[PDB]
Design a protein around this ligand. Structure first.
Ligand SMILES: *[C@@H]1O[C@H](CO)[C@@H](O[C@@H]2O[C@H](CO)[C@@H](O)[C@H](O)[C@H]2NC(C)=O)[C@H](O)[C@H]1NC(C)=O
Ligand SMILES: *[C@@H]1O[C@H](CO)[C@@H](O[C@@H]2O[C@H](CO)[C@@H](O)[C@H](O)[C@H]2NC(C)=O)[C@H](O)[C@H]1NC(C)=O
Ligand SMILES: *[C@@H]1O[C@H](CO)[C@@H](O[C@@H]2O[C@H](CO)[C@@H](O)[C@H](O)[C@H]2NC(C)=O)[C@H](O)[C@H]1NC(C)=O
Ligand SMILES: *[C@@H]1O[C@H](CO)[C@@H](O[C@@H]2O[C@H](CO)[C@@H](O)[C@H](O)[C@H]2NC(C)=O)[C@H](O)[C@H]1NC(C)=O
Ligand SMILES: *[C@@H]1O[C@H](CO)[C@@H](O[C@@H]2O[C@H](CO)[C@@H](O)[C@H](O)[C@H]2NC(C)=O)[C@H](O)[C@H]1NC(C)=O
Ligand SMILES: *[C@@H]1O[C@H](CO)[C@@H](O)[C@H](O)[C@H]1NC(C)=O
Ligand SMILES: *[C@@H]1O[C@H](CO)[C@@H](O)[C@H](O)[C@H]1NC(C)=O
Lengths: 49, 99, 170, 50, 50
């Protein structure tokens, strides 16, 4: 734990990036978290919502 | 600011997204008690250390630098005269050598 | 306590984990700040029972034995002058331990000068220490020794004026 | 399942109830071909900053 | 437990005694300071929309 100060910065940046990529898997109330599924399953009037 | 102790120098070292400073400092060690006085009374005159401090090993009085014990004879070359002995609180009587 | 609300909240992902992690980082950063400010000494220094400092009075800044909080009168006045899922975490250092740290720093700087901050605490008489400080700002030791009663009186008067100014200014 | 990516031959061995594989972001990074039952990695097409 | 602030050290103060060091230690200490982070760039259109 001698170089913990640099390791905390590296871990915080990697954790922020990891959480940013984990946010893509959430649908945020939509029917799916994948855009391609929505474009293949729905007409544009509901797809815009 | 540059390590614990009296700072002597420092050395930089590169680190991944960082810097490591090796601070070389001076730490005092092996201190010893001495009896001290603010001034020396000699010939009705008060003598004060020019850069050091008056110390006594029990029977004899010396002047030494403040951060390292190096006792020297109290002379007129490492002391200066200001006023008489009536003003300074705690002045002690000791001879002052003249080269 | 609504389960349907939490089921709908899980659709938004790990926002709550992010907010709790940020608040936890702030909460541990406050304790780190208090460690960095007050815990700079690993030795708990104490003043001697006899307060013979050559006329210098530190009673307004040294801890009061009569008070159960072991605070100085100035620190006691300072503490008197400051007044749905939410929780307040207590600080790691309580107020009496922070006061003990400040008391150790005061005892070190009174009995040893600046020597305790650079290594072992080396005792020195306080007028001699003041003379060293006088030489640091380029004034000869003799000036301090000749006018020592006046300097001690001015220091005590200024410390009392500090207490009066804190007690008289809201 | 639509998408855009480079298709390469894969070393992953799918269980027979598995058709696709998801990464961290729940994008299909491995897929089984429905005619010849073989596994393919789907690396994304290159992205750059101009 | 209640955490110990540190060891007690009563400095032997008196009005005519001084402590003078007779020796010294050349002490080297480390200080680690972060300087930079990883330079990350995120394409907002590609992140939101692919
Ligand atoms: C204080 O220091 C002085 C000088 O270092 C000591 O005086 C010398 O002591 C030695 C040992 O007995 C003698 O051989 C010398 O002749 C002394 N020199 C003089 C000029 O007297 C003195 O003994 C020390 N005092 C104590 C209590 O340690
Ligand atoms: C230091 O020396 C001074 C001067 O030699 C001493 O002062 C004298 O003290 C005697 C008796 O106490 C008096 O009779 C003289 O009149 C004093 N002379 C002066 C000029 O003040 C003093 O007592 C000495 N102190 C020590 C501790 O040795
Ligand atoms: C140091 O200062 C304190 C406070 O300024 C002095 O305490 C005062 O003492 C007088 C007479 O002894 C009392 O009438 C006051 O009420 C005291 N004030 C407080 C706030 O307690 C103290 O005498 C001074 N000197 C020493 C040596 O401690
Ligand atoms: C300087 O002298 C003081 C007092 O004579 C020494 O302090 C004593 O140290 C012993 C052992 O460390 C303790 O048992 C005593 O309680 C202390 N007394 C006081 C009044 O603090 C001190 O150790 C001496 N310093 C050196 C470097 O020898
Ligand atoms: C000052 O301290 C140093 C240690 O840093 C002492 O050097 C040691 O002395 C002993 C006995 O002479 C030797 O066995 C060691 O090997 C020495 N160590 C090193 C690193 O040289 C030195 O003697 C001390 N000096 C005084 C005057 O106390
Ligand atoms: C130091 O204190 C003693 C009493 O412990 C006293 O006799 C002596 O005069 C004092 N010296 C100074 C310089 O205050
Ligand atoms: C037809 O599809 C089946 C899987 O349903 C596979 O086993 C078979 O090999 C395929 N045949 C041809 C000619 O592609």
């Amino acid at each position: 734990s001698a170089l913990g100060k640099l390791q905390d910065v590296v871990n915080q940046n990697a954790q922020a990036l990891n959480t940013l990529v984990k946010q893509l898997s959430s649908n945020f109330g939509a029917i799916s978290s994948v855009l391609n599924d929505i474009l293949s399953r729905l007409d544009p009037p509901e797809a815009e919502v | 600011f540059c390590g614990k102790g009296y700072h002597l120098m420092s050395f930089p070292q590169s680190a991944p997204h960082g810097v490591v400073f090796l601070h070389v400092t001076y730490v005092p060690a092996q201190e010893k008690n001495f009896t001290t006085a603010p001034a020396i009374c000699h010939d009705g005159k008060a003598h004060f250390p020019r850069e050091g401090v008056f110390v006594s090993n029990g029977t004899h009085w010396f002047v030494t630098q403040r951060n390292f014990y190096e006792p020297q004879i109290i002379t007129t070359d490492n002391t200066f005269v200001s006023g008489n002995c009536d003003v300074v609180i705690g002045i002690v009587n000791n001879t002052v050598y003249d080269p | 306590d609504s389960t349907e609300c939490s089921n709908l909240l899980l659709q938004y992902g790990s926002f709550c984990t992010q907010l709790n992690r940020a608040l936890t980082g702030i909460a541990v950063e406050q304790d780190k700040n208090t460690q960095e400010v007050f815990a700079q000494v690993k030795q708990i220094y104490k003043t001697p029972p006899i307060k013979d400092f050559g006329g210098f009075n530190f009673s307004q800044i040294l801890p009061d034995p009569s008070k159960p909080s072991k605070r100085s009168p100035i620190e006691d006045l300072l503490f008197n002058k400051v007044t749905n899922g939410l929780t307040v975490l207590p600080p790691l250092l309580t107020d009496e331990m922070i006061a003990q740290y400040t008391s150790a720093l005061l005892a070190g700087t009174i009995t040893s000068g600046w020597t305790f901050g650079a290594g072992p605490a080396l005792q020195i008489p306080f007028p001699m220490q003041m003379a060293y400080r006088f030489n640091g700002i380029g004034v000869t030791q003799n000036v301090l020794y000749e006018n020592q009663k006046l300097i001690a009186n001015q220091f005590n008067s200024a410390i009392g004026k500090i207490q009066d100014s804190l007690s008289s200014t809201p | 399942l639509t998408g855009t990516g480079v298709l390469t031959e894969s070393n992953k061995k799918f269980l027979p109830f598995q058709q696709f594989g998801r990464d961290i972001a729940d994008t299909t990074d491995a897929v089984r071909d429905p005619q010849t039952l073989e596994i393919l990695d789907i690396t994304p097409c290159s992205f750059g900053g101009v | 437990y209640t955490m110990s602030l540190g060891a007690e050290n009563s400095v032997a103060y008196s009005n005519n005694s001084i402590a003078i060091p007779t020796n010294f230690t050349i002490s080297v200490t480390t200080e680690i300071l972060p300087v930079s982070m990883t330079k990350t760039s995120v394409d907002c259109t590609m992140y939101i929309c692919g």
